Design a protein around this ligand. Sequence first.
Ligand code: HEM
Length: 152
Amino acid sequence: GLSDGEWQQVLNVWGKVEADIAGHGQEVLIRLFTGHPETLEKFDKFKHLKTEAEMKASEDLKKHGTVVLTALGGILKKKGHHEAELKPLAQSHATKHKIPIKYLEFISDAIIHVLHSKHPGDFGADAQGAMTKALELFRNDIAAKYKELGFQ
Ligand code: HEM
């Protein structure tokens, strides 16, 4: 549950991501894969990437980064009213991709990390607080659908 002031901060921060969605998307995925290598195993089309250099050089990884952040942005722009947008994502990630909720925690923190890295001194305390709450909300609503499906 976010205030309007907090949503405003979220969408303000998101404006940064939208100026370069592929660059941000790329760095988030790289931060995830290198920070948590077990996550790489869930991707049959990235599992070949052994080195971070190969990750950085991968246009298909950048492509998928765009897909992921485009979807997250669509959801964020709903300001919490994202049931229709979120349900198919929860369903595919539980039933097809088999992504435990722990990995959504991983990518959440990675987004926070990337924003500080790309915008040092430009991602203030209030902005981080708002973005973190927004990602917690996202995660929590996925978690509810996971529970429904009995997925661990
Ligand atoms: C902000 C969080 C995330 C968002 C918004 C997101 C979004 C998406 C979207 C839109 C797709 C393509 C449509 C679909 O299959 O449902 C997708 C595919 C996929 N996602 Fe996610 N995702 C997120 C997190 C994760 C995480 C943390 C993992 C694994 C650690 C993951 C694993 C996958 C895999 C394996 C696919 C299919 C890739 C392929 O073979 O094309 N996702 N995701």
